[PDB]
Amino acid sequence: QTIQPGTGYNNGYFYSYWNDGHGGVTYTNGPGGQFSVNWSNSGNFVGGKGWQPGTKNKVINFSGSYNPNGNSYLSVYGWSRNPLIEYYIVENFGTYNPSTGATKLGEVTSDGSVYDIYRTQRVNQPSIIGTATFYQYWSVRRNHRSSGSVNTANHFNAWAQQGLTLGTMDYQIVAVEGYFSSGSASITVS
């Protein structure tokens, strides 16, 4: 069902929906591992379904439609504790490449495409433990897609080779993030 910002479990899957309060975003929890996001002249938001906690070897499946109209990303997104890390495995994005301003560390081939690996540091930014300083790891897919399977192990291993040691996995979801744009999406996670 269409809900206001929050987290919980819907039809067997963990979900997380958040927005900056700007308005113009509609998140709806669908059947099974499905969720739909419809936005127009929105602010910043992150919404999706997945697991809590996630794992370091989970093969995530997603399918559906992703129609961004401006700045937006479709990716496997999650967190880690000790060390506190926010990560992204971007499968598709709109007009803005989220790796802009990030330092490229390397490349990795996974699930039918090469990914560019990046790392950025977020100083005194909100996190799952409140305002904190943490690194942000990125894996941007060269061949965009809205359906497929992501073998998280391939990414976590590539990141580990570049100097990343993930600790305790917190949530791991397939999320749609929008940044002052418009669009629609209906993704089903498995």
UniProtKB/Swiss-Prot annotation:
Tree of life domain: Eukaryota
Any GO molecular function: endo-1,4-beta-xylanase activity
Residues annotated as domain GH11: 2-189
GO biological process: xylan catabolic process
Glycosylation sites: N38, N61
Pathway linked to the protein: Glycan degradation; xylan degradation
Induction of expression: Induced by D-xylose, dependent on the cellulase and xylanase regulator xyr1. Repressed by glucose through negative regulation by the crabon catabolite repressor cre1.
Residues passing through the membrane, by range: none
Active site per the UniProt annotation: E86 (nucleophile), E177 (proton donor)
Catalytic activity: Endohydrolysis of (1->4)-beta-D-xylosidic linkages in xylans
This enzyme's EC code(s): 3.2.1.8
Subcellular location as annotated: Secreted
pH-activity note: Optimum pH is 4.5-5.5. Stable from pH 3.0 to 8.5 at room temperature and from pH 4.0 to 7.5 at 40 degrees Celsius.
UniProt keywords, alphabetically: Carbohydrate metabolism, Glycoprotein, Glycosidase, Hydrolase, Polysaccharide degradation, Pyrrolidone carboxylic acid, Secreted, Signal, Xylan degradation
Cellular component GO terms, alphabetical: extracellular region
Residues that bind substrate: Y73, Y77, Y88, R122, P126, Q136, Y171
Family that this chain belongs to: Belongs to the glycosyl hydrolase 11 (cellulase G) family.
Functional description taken from the UniProt entry: Glycoside hydrolase involved in the hydrolysis of xylan, a major plant cell wall hemicellulose made up of 1,4-beta-linked D-xylopyranose residues. Catalyzes the endohydrolysis of the main-chain 1,4-beta-glycosidic bonds connecting the xylose subunits yielding various xylooligosaccharides and xylose. The catalysis proceeds by a double-displacement reaction mechanism with a putative covalent glycosyl-enzyme intermediate, with retention of the anomeric configuration. Produces xylobiose and xylose as the main degradation products.
The protein's name in its UniProt record: Endo-1,4-beta-xylanase 2
Organism whose genome encodes this protein: Hypocrea jecorina (strain ATCC 56765 / BCRC 32924 / NRRL 11460 / Rut C-30)
Residues of the full protein shown: 35 to 223 of 223
